[PDB]
Amino acid sequence: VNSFSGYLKLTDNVYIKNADIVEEAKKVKPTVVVNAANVYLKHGGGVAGALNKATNNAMQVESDDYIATNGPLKVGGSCVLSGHNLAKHCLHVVGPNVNKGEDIQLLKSAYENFNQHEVLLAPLLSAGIFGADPIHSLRVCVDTVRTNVYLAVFDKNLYDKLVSSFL
Numbered sequence: 801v802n803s804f805s806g807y808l809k810l811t812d813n814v815y816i817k818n819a820d821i822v823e824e825a826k827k828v829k830p831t832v833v834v835n836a837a838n839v840y841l842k843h844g845g846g847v848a849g850a851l852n853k854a855t856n857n858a859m860q861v862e863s864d865d866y867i868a869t870n871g872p873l874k875v876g877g878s879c880v881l882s883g884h885n886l887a888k889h890c891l892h893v894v895g896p897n898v899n900k901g902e903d904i905q906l907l908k909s910a911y912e913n914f915n916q917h918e919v920l921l922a923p924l925l926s927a928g929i930f931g932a933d934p935i936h937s938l939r940v941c942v943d944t945v946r947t948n949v950y951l952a953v954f955d956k957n958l959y960d961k962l963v964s965s966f967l
């Protein structure tokens with residue numbers, strides 16, 4: 801038993817809810833919140849901008865130090881940093897950005913990072929401003945992640961569509 805509430809169960813291990821991941825994160829304090837990061841950890845908009853804003857820019861400050869030491873992430877890759885006031889840890893995961901021409905097949909590699917964590921609160925990778933089809937992101941998620949993932953979908957219209965079209 802864990803503290804996530806109001807989720808619909810899609811599979812043995814994948815759950816979904818219409819929620820703001822920032823507000824969901826501040827209430828659950830999950831062990832891991834996933835950020836929809838880019839390779840530079842420049843948290844300007846979308847989920848990342850919103851998560852970073854909720855940390856009063858502390859996420860960005862920590863991220864800039866990470867990049868200065870380690871260089872950029874790979875598309876499909878991840879790093880674990882602090883969760884600040886939102887979670888114990890933040891798993892920054894880089895899904896392909898269709899609006900940059902990145903290969904959608906890397907979406908599976910991106911979701912594989914979730915398997916290193918027993919339980920996660922996450923957005924749909926490559927959705928939103930990253931330009932992928934969220935229905936496809938949810939299919940790849942279900943077919944790739946084996947650990948317990950709680951998906952927060954900000955848009956109520958999208959949430960209902962994802963549920964109604966799920967196979």
Ligand SMILES: O=C(O)C[C@@H]1CCCN(c2ncnc3nc[nH]c23)C1
Pocket residue numbers: 820821822845846847850923924927928929930952953954955958
């Ligand atoms: O509806 C969804 O979950 C998908 C969208 C796609 C566009 C970017 N996204 C977001 N952008 C800015 N703030 C957000 N807070 C929660 N999600 C946020 C998520």
